[PDB]
């Protein structure tokens, strides 16, 4: 079992137990977390660095210099406001003297570098930004990976992919930093913050396959995302949107649910808010799981109304390649043309599908139709079509929701 022989090589593993983050190896790393470090707020293994201050000092116990392979692996996520910051700053410290390694971001990168004891380094870059886009990696969740061999290259993969490489085999001994620092020591601001969840060593070079399982394995495939990689959650306003109109929101137009434009692209908190309520009675704020049953709810101009299915389909019972526009209604309740259900869809992720079983099987979906009865108008619509299977990977059909999270703040 490679699971096995990827889990008995762990030599540090930070995990909350009994809401302590500790080293849950066998090994036995003193941690000393700062006081207002905040533990456990996205997932289990998570911590926030919100602040200079903030650290996490991890004391590796008595098992000089490196003497073996070696893998280093977490999850980061970096508010929008450190990433824009054309400065540099040391997030992971693991330099003594100067030999060692450090994990920096600088200007929307991040960068690993490892020094031995001349100071020669080798360092591996990955622009996580991509100047911002909405299609880049600005607060959200992504896995890292740093592999090391020390008769060969440094790796550094990204979500299982690898990036870069370096040769190190080259460079001097690196001397091994027993004590490990986690946090900014640079004089940040209130919206300059980052997570990092589920931090691992291990004493081995990781394959890009066992890269994969440890991959695959943290991201939590039956729990559905939000925008950022977070867990989706009941009771929570997201703004929904369709992969294929990212800068369209969703708002009734004489009842019929329609995509309009964003008055401004660079603004994600625009639209209606829609609250996604549990039909099972689930515990408030509780996760949503794969395949889950749901019902959705919009504030619109003040007021909640439920998201329906329509009752006839929009050229109009049908059979046969039939499509539904969406509406609203002021009635709370349980209605099973209201009921949906959610899926994962996977390399592409943080998106989700969405289904109704409600008297034919649908799938949502987003394109251009004249859903209005009494006008011939077109608009961009979601639709809930029977007859998808060819459409399962049509990222019309693919849906972000994006929550207010602190690390992306929006003038008020
Ligand atoms: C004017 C308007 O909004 N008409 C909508 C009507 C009325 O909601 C329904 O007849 C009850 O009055 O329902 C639909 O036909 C439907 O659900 O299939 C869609 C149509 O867009």
Same mark, same amino acid.
């Given at each position: 079992s490679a699971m096995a022989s990827i889990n008995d090589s762990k030599i540090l593993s930070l995990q909350n137990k009994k809401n302590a983050l500790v080293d849950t190896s066998g090994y036995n790393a003193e941690v000393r977390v700062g006081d207002n470090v905040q533990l456990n707020t996205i997932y289990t293994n998570d911590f926030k660095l919100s602040s200079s201050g903030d650290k996490i000092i991890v004391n590796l116990?008595?098992?000089? !210099?490196?003497?073996?392979?070696? #893998?280093?692996?977490? +999850?980061i996520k970096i508010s929008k406001d450190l990433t824009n910051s054309h400065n540099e700053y040391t997030i992971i410290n693991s330099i003594e003297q100067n030999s060692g390694w450090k994990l920096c971001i600088r200007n929307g990168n991040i960068e690993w570098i490892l020094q031995d004891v001349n100071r020669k380094y080798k360092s591996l870059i990955f622009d996580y930004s991509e100047s911002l886009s909405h299609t880049g990696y600005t607060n959200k969740w992504?896995?890292?990976? =740093?592999?090391?061999?020390?008769?060969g290259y440094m790796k550094l993969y990204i979500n299982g992919e690898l990036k870069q490489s370096q040769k190190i085999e080259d460079l001097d001994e690196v001397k091994l930093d027993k004590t490990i620092v986690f946090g900014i020591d640079e004089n940040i601001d209130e919206n300059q913050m980052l997570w990092i969840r589920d931090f691992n060593i291990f004493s081995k070079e990781l394959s890009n396959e066992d890269i994969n399982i440890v991959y695959e394995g943290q991201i939590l495939r039956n $729990?559905?995302?939000?925008? +950022?990689?977070?867990?989706?959650?009941?009771?929570?306003?997201?703004?929904?949107?369709?992969?294929?109109?990212?800068?369209?929101? =969703?708002?009734?137009?004489?009842? $019929?649910?329609?995509?309009?434009?964003?008055?401004?692209?660079?603004?994600?908190?625009?639209?209606?808010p829609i609250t996604i309520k549990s039909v099972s009675d689930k515990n408030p704020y509780?996760?949503?799981?794969?395949?889950?049953?749901?019902?959705?709810?919009?504030?619109?101009? #003040?007021?909640?109304?439920?998201?329906?299915?329509?009752?006839?389909?929009?050229? !109009?019972? @049908?059979?046969?390649? @039939?499509?539904? !526009?969406?509406?609203?209604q002021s009635n709370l %309740?349980?209605?099973?043309?209201?009921?949906?259900? =959610?899926?994962?869809? $996977?390399?592409?992720?943080? @998106?989700?599908?969405?289904?109704?079983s409600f008297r034919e099987n649908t799938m949502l979906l987003a394109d251009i139709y004249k859903p209005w009865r009494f006008?011939?108008?077109? !608009?961009?619509?979601?639709?809930?079509?029977?007859?998808?299977?060819?459409?399962?990977?049509?990222?019309?059909?693919? +849906?972000?929701?994006?929550?207010?999270?602190? %690390? +992306?703040?929006?003038?008020?």
């Open positions: 116990n008595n098992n000089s !210099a490196i003497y073996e392979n070696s #893998s280093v692996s977490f +999850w992504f896995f890292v990976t =740093i592999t090391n061999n020390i008769m $729990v559905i995302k939000d925008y +950022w990689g977070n867990p989706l959650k009941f009771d929570t306003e997201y703004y929904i949107i369709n992969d294929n109109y990212i800068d369209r929101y =969703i708002a009734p137009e004489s009842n $019929v649910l329609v995509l309009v434009q964003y008055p401004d692209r660079s603004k994600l908190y625009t639209g209606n509780s996760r949503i799981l794969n395949g889950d049953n749901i019902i959705l709810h919009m504030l619109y101009n #003040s007021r909640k109304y439920m998201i329906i299915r329509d009752t006839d389909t929009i050229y !109009a019972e @049908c059979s046969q390649n @039939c499509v539904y !526009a969406l509406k609203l %309740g349980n209605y099973g043309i209201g009921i949906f259900s =959610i899926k994962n869809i $996977v390399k592409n992720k943080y @998106c989700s599908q969405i289904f109704s006008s011939f108008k077109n !608009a961009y619509t979601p639709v809930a079509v029977t007859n998808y299977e060819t459409k399962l990977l049509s990222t019309s059909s693919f +849906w972000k929701f994006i929550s207010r999270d602190p %690390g +992306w703040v929006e003038p008020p």
